[PDB]
Amino acid sequence: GFLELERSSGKLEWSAILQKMASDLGFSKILFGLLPKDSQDYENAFIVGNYPAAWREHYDRAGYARVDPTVSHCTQSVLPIFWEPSIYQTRKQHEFFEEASAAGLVYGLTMPLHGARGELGALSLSVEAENRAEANRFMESVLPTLWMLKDYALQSGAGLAFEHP
Amino acid sequence: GFLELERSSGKLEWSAILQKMASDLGFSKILFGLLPKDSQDYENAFIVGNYPAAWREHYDRAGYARVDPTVSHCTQSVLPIFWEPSIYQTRKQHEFFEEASAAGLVYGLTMPLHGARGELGALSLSVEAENRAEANRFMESVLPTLWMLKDYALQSGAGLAFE
Ligand SMILES: COCOc1c(Br)cc(Br)cc1CNC(=O)c1ccccc1[N+](=O)[O-]
Numbered sequence A: 001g002f003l004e005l006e007r008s009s010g011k012l013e014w015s016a017i018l019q020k021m022a023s024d025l026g027f028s029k030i031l032f033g034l035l036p037k038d039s040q041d042y043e044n045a046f047i048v049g050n051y052p053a054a055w056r057e058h059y060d061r062a063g064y065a066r067v068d069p070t071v072s073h074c075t076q077s078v079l080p081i082f083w084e085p086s087i088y089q090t091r092k093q094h095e096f097f098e099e100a101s102a103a104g105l106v107y108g109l110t111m112p113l114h115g116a117r118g119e120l121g122a123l124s125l126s127v128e129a130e131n132r133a134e135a136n137r138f139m140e141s142v143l144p145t146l147w148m149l150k151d152y153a154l155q156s157g158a159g160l161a162f163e164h165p
Numbered sequence B: 001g002f003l004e005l006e007r008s009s010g011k012l013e014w015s016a017i018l019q020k021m022a023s024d025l026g027f028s029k030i031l032f033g034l035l036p037k038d039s040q041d042y043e044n045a046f047i048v049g050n051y052p053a054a055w056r057e058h059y060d061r062a063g064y065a066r067v068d069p070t071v072s073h074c075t076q077s078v079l080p081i082f083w084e085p086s087i088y089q090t091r092k093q094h095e096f097f098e099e100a101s102a103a104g105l106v107y108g109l110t111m112p113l114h115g116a117r118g119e120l121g122a123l124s125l126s127v128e129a130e131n132r133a134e135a136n137r138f139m140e141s142v143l144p145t146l147w148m149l150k151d152y153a154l155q156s157g158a159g160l161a162f163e
């Protein structure tokens, strides 16, 4: 199923395919973000997915890239960070989690992306669940496949974002 | 289970755990290699595994880092490169295949490693098999586990190697 990502032509089809693959793994909302090597801001970012517009706008306007604990995590690790007030510490981080929750994004994980040419990014995925224990069971159940998916998305996504005409 | 690598005491236990994980998965030979960001040579390389000494020595002496097709692959991709006839394009690369085979290393794959701090490496694993069909069937059954393994190995190995 992974070959479909490479086979696709255009940001639209590629995003639709990734969203569908994520949905099949139990995740209703995803965000794929990728920056060029040594990017100093977000001007040149490639960001696609189905997170709600209002949340995307608010995150930007509130400067949450400097608050969201997953951002710094991604600069330090190749391993996923699960969304837990716990990775929250500060007042603004409590605010961030409260607002994410209100936006419907409560349980999930962020998988760091580190490309062969120094690309830096993240594949973030939200899972709908009754509670955290259930969310954790849903996520653990698909983790091996998601682990493959994130690398296929990185390899094909970097090409689509930064290379292919 | 994968966190056992990070929770190892040092280089010796980390190496033993990694080799044991690979073996339990069915790979009798593994090599983990890692370079610091923007390395010009192999002077600061962290290289661990149970590839035979004779093959390790020959690879170095022959300058096979400039021939081995997996090397350039790792600079270009995060996806695994399987050891298949198609990856050996030139006679020099074909000779590499024959020499690795003579050393007992015929079937396998190489997983590129790209760390959060610019580390560059590879995790290579060989499986003992009678033919390519048996090797493929086996590798397909363990591939998702191996895929998680390589990132856990990278994160822990990087912390061990460069701090
Ligand atoms: C990692 O780099 C930052 O990437 C972005 C960008 Br850019 C915009 C937005 Br919006 C969100 C993220 C990633 N964070 C999350 O998905 C996240 C993580 C924990 C908890 C709740 C959320 N969430 O957003 O619901």
Ligand SMILES: COCOc1c(Br)cc(Br)cc1CNC(=O)c1ccccc1[N+](=O)[O-]
Binding pocket: B031, B033, B047, B051, B055, B056, B059, B065, B068, B070, B071, B074, B083, B097, B100, B105, B110, B121, B122, B124, B125
């Ligand atoms: C990628 O960076 C280079 O890493 C090294 C270093 Br350093 C030393 C040695 Br020895 C081997 C490798 C990796 N290659 C392989 O395992 C390999 C790949 C295809 C076929 C046969 C082999 N093999 O060696 O049997």
